[model samples]
Target chain A: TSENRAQVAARQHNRKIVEQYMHTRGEARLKRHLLFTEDGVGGLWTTDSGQPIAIRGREKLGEHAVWSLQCFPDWVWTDIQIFETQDPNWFWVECRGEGAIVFPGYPRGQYRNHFLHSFRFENGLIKEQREFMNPCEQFRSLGIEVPEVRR
Target chain B: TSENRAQVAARQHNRKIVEQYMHTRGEARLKRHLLFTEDGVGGLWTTDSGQPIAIRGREKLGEHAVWSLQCFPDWVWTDIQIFETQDPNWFWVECRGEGAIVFPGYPRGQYRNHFLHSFRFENGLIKEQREFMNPCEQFRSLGIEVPEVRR
Candidate 1:
């Protein structure tokens, strides 16, 4: 219906931003600065009690990609489900991530993690993003030990 | 467009199921058995390395709610974002959950957890479901000791 016309465009625009951001991480063509707002905010809410890695602008997001790519050269993200709600600028992404880590003796194909990403966009650029995953268990799969939680 | 009629109906139907399931839990009117399928499979995928609690049939699902409600008598789930994809039967729900646990000395309202749930339905009943959350941090906030992960 024509009622959804405005929503449909915003949905497409945001989806394109998300898709480009995810797909162009490792590729040289990725211009990280173009993906985020000048004053964007992002955080990795990996643990409830711990301090999250606060992200601002595009540089922090790029640094994150650089660090992760160093460990998993063949990392890939598959969006199993993308939810576009009434707010077209806000979308929820459920992704399955697989990476073949460079760690020796670590089981191959065991570094599979699921993530729920919330992205809010402004003018086809990300303004706010929050990512959630189980870091303790995710790192454990590769025989890596993260800082022990109180448990 | 008329082509969207089927999608619209399924979307409404599935959203209704999700809304009811979230709101009815811990309520007397909830029939957990009616929410799941006979051979349904579900797991609390809190950690990637830790073995997930595999769920089968509706009985298991009901037991989970019972156990959780015991901890947080006033537990509530608010869907922050819901993803309905090409497959109408499959939906991704991102939720913010808060519960005031009964544990002594535990902080009230600190049991806030963000969860990404994937639900696959069959005839309006859930056939598959997987839930993800950061248990290490989620529990640590309340000073609870979950079995230490390898990390």
Candidate 2:
């Protein structure tokens, strides 16, 4: 029956929702799941809802945080570094620090100490997220707390 | 002479900047100062930046955090929280919770825990923010070490 087929389709759609929720949650929890791990490029660690959270020495913040996220594409990740945490579900990672990091309001050297963070899960998807790191304190002030693991 | 006027204007403008900075910083410092010794409105004591840091409620995280700073219209006292210490200048007072407290995502009245938050600052003011909270395991999930702040 067509109605039966419709019901099946609806069930499948709901299953996808569950899958997405589980998938995202897995990324937040597994820590090693490439489909959702910090090491995975542009996977678990992304910037604000908008573009790459780029901080170039030439561009002011309003241009990047406000205009870029609002106007252009999202910032893509080149590399990511994860940090040790007390909880299995909670993890912190660093985005684009040394090697070849360059951005506005920051020196054209290896970027260090910037964080990519994720947390809060229900049924396996990220229910809430919070990221913390002191770039001004790190790159600007020339301090490094997590030098070994911090990217 | 127009040159004299320009010089005076520049000096006055610079003075205004300094005055405004101290005025705002003073307000913030005063609030924290009051919280440490004063009861009812202010509670606890610590130092953040050059000023003392204090929270008004027993639990400095969740509902207490909201009640402590919700005095301003639409949250005008929004710079108490800091993020991206990249600029040392970046500051924003944003918070997160799980379950019903967050609304739209968690079930009604379900947001149960606090998560670390990331903030962006602008012109010595709070410009933007993002937060994460986990209600799944309450405080136990995040491995919070601080003893529950009691009233």
Q: Which candidate ranks first by lDDT, i.e. highest?
A: 1
Compared with the true structure, what per-residue lDDT tens digits does model 2 show for residues A1-151?
Answer: 9967655554444334334423332123323232222221222222212123433222232232343233212233435543323233333444542233333443444333344454433333333344543323222332222111100
Tens-digit lDDT track for model 2 on B1-151? Answer: 9966654554444334323422342225324322221222222111112122333332232244444333221222222322222133222223333222222232223223233443332332223323432212222222322121110
Candidate 1 per-residue lDDT over residues A45-151, each given as its tens digit: 77534556777877766676565566677777786657665677887777877767665455654577777888888877889988887776555666655543321
Q: For every model shown, what is its TM-score relative to the native structure? A: 0.75, 0.23
**lDDT, model 2:** 0.31
lDDT of 1 by residue, B1-151 (tens): 7758876776678878876666764664237557778888777877534657777877776676666666678777786667776577888777788777665455553577777888888877788888887776555556655443221
Give the DockQ (C-alpha) for candidate 1. Answer: 0.31
Give the alpha-carbon lDDT of every model. 0.70, 0.31
**Pairs in steric clash, model 1:** A83-B83
**Which residues of candidate 2, in runs, are more than 4 Å off?**
A1-108, A114-116, A125-151, B1-31, B36-75, B78-151
Q: Which numbered prediction scores highest in TM-score against the true structure?
A: 1
